[PDB]
Symmetry: C4
Subunit: 25 residues, 4 copies
Amino acid sequence: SSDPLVVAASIMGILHLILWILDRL
Amino acid sequence: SSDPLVVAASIMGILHLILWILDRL
Amino acid sequence: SSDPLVVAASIMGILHLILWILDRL
Amino acid sequence: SSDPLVVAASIMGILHLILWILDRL
Ligand SMILES: CCCCCCCCO[C@H]1O[C@@H](CO)[C@H](O)[C@H](O)[C@@H]1O
Ligand SMILES: CCCCCCCCO[C@H]1O[C@@H](CO)[C@H](O)[C@H](O)[C@@H]1O
Ligand SMILES: CCCCCCCCO[C@H]1O[C@@H](CO)[C@H](O)[C@H](O)[C@@H]1O
Ligand SMILES: [Cl-]
């Protein structure tokens, strides 16, 4: 499976997209 | 192999690049 | 080992972040 | 475990987030 550090960076990417979308709305 | 979440973040990233390329063309 | 989609996105992220850093200098 | 390029991209993503925060400070 993926390294915790990689998991953490992917979560950061996903949250950033969600925050950006919420801001645009 | 890779965690679902990490695969999903990668697909978002690839889509992000496609969209940017399309915008610039 | 990593999913091939994850390696490909990582390589794109690296190039992107490299360009970002050069500009920030 | 995760490929070296995947680990590297994740670290560079974390570096970017931190440079972005410090930039605003
Ligand atoms: C603690 C983990 C939360 C990470 C989510 C916040 C990431 C915000 O950081 C981002 O702000 C962007 C604005 O769209 C800028 O374009 C920057 O490139 C930066 O990466
Ligand atoms: C998960 C990592 C995938 C990385 C995909 C890169 C997303 C491309 O998108 C970015 O392209 C840059 C130039 O290439 C532009 O300066 C913009 O910041 C754009 O958002
Ligand atoms: C800019 C900072 C980037 C640092 C990148 C370090 C990533 C390497 O890290 C990798 O090294 C491998 C050696 O082949 C080990 O086998 C480990 O699996 C590890 O993932
Ligand atoms: Cl991985």
